């Protein structure tokens, strides 16, 4: 699966976690914090994406991304 495909899955769960962003555009340089999703929900998004992709690895391996594009990259690499 591609970086761009993964990014679309991240966008879906972000909009699901934060319904006020249903219609707004989401750039790969947007950060969940500035959007601004709270600490628990930022982890929830990561875990939903993991489960969607059946990725059974330590959650900490998805830490450290500064924006959703970098998060897409992180997932893409696994």
């Amino acid at each position: 699966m591609s970086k761009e495909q993964v990014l679309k899955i991240i966008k879906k769960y972000t909009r699901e976690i934060a319904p006020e962003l249903e219609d707004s555009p989401l750039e790969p340089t947007d950060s969940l914090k500035k959007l601004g999703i709270d600490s628990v929900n930022r982890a929830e998004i990561i875990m939903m994406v993991m489960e969607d992709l059946s990725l059974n690895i330590p959650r900490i391996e998805l830490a450290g991304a500064k924006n959703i594009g970098e998060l897409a990259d992180l997932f893409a690499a696994k």
Binding site: D38, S39, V40, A43, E44, I46, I60, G64
Partner: protein
């Protein structure tokens, strides 16, 4: 062989800050911290430190003991990430001001917020070793957040102060431990740390993911050792290290989803029944580090239902990291004893700081920075706070003289 907590006593500080005032002062929505289940954090005054917090936590336990039973305390373990010396344990001061026996092993234990559980397990093993039949251990988890005015800014809303004292023995009136029912898991990770005195550094997002990984793995280790255990059916309540309530809700949800494939409404009902009782006192003190899981246990006991004996599952985490899942049982009698401690009343009688007083307190905290050789405390820094302490038989830090800390009962 019977073992566990014979007595439990808490000190939640002399003052607290309402997080809604912190939000209003940062022009955040008041619901931000409500969303995260945070209400108040306890705040240490300059004339308090982890020793005074520890002594105030333990004093009621020692006060109730016979001279004979007090002399049976032969180990004092202080569990902290807020130490005051690189070599001298706080246990020496604690022994001095509680009047404990000189025939006593004394030391301090460190692994972020896992410290308390580690101390408790060591005390348990002393009892189980049967090396000294009748000996008791005093384990005190004690921590403050003395941040000076940052690396620590991320943690300001959550970083509290408190201590919980445990007396551990072969007559566990409060919490009877399930012996051998332990799972643990850890690895090196830079999630948060305290690499400079009076500070903290970290990536909170990494720490939450690490907490979740450990919650799953420590429990799986327990499950591998305790045949037939079920995450819903075997535990009447669940207590957790609680950096803030919202993340405990998230962890419980993750566990229920994975282990029980539970649906969202079912998970939220289970949360309210089994986890919310433990969060009640935690929400009034904030993250009190190594003591938080023990405060959650005390909260579960006061706020849950103990009309028949109940099993509580305990999850401990400390950044860095290490974690443990373990369990025990509380009876109706134990719950009745714990209720007499009056924790809720203690917490309600603390001084409610304004944002102005809080900012001044941060500023004045520098006087008692780590490494201070000489300082004489002004107890009238905040006259109104003093009025809430004076006459209650509280220990406070009076002075440091040539690095020697001196305390006073006020």
């Amino acid at each position: 062989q019977q073992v566990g907590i014979e007595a439990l006593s808490v000190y939640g500080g002399a003052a607290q800050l309402e997080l809604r005032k912190l939000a209003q002062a940062r022009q955040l929505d008041i619901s931000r911290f409500d969303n995260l289940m945070m209400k108040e954090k306890a705040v240490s005054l300059p004339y308090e430190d982890p020793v005074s917090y520890a002594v105030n936590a333990a004093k009621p336990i020692i006060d109730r003991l016979s001279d004979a039973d007090k002399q049976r305390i032969e180990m004092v373990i202080t569990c902290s990430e807020s130490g005051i010396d690189f070599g001298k344990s706080m246990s020496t001061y604690i022994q001095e001001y509680l009047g404990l026996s000189r025939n006593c092993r004394m030391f301090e234990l460190k692994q972020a917020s896992y410290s308390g559980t580690a101390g408790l397990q060591m005390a348990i093993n002393l009892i189980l070793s049967q090396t000294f039949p009748g000996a008791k251990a005093l384990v005190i988890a004690t921590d403050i957040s003395r941040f000076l005015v940052y690396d620590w800014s991320f943690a300001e809303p959550s970083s509290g102060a408190g201590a919980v004292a445990l007396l551990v023995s072969d007559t566990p009136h409060i919490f009877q431990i399930d012996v051998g029912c332990n799972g643990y898991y850890g690895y090196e990770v830079m999630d948060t740390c305290r690499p400079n005195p009076d500070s903290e550094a970290g990536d909170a997002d990494l720490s939450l993911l690490s907490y979740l990984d450990c919650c799953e793995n420590a429990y799986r280790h327990y499950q591998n050792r305790v045949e037939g255990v079920d995450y819903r059916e075997s535990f009447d309540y669940l207590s957790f290290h609680t950096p803030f309530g919202g993340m405990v809700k998230g962890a419980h949800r993750n566990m229920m989803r994975r282990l029980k494939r539970a649906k969202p409404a079912e998970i939220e009902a289970d949360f309210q029944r089994r986890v919310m009782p433990g969060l009640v006192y935690c929400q009034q003190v904030g993250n009190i580090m190594g003591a938080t899981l023990f405060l959650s246990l005390a909260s579960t006991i006061d706020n849950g239902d103990f009309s028949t004996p109940r099993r509580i599952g305990m999850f401990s985490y400390g950044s860095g990291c290490c974690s443990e899942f373990y369990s025990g049982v509380v009876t109706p009698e134990g719950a009745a004893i714990a209720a007499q401690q009056g924790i809720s009343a203690q917490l309600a009688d603390r001084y409610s700081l304004s944002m102005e007083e809080y900012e001044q307190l941060l500023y004045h905290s520098s006087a008692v920075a780590f490494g201070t050789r000489n300082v004489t405390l002004d107890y009238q820094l905040f006259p109104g706070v003093w009025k809430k302490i004076a006459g209650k038989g509280r220990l406070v830090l009076k002075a440091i003289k040539e690095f020697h800390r001196k305390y006073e009962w006020v």
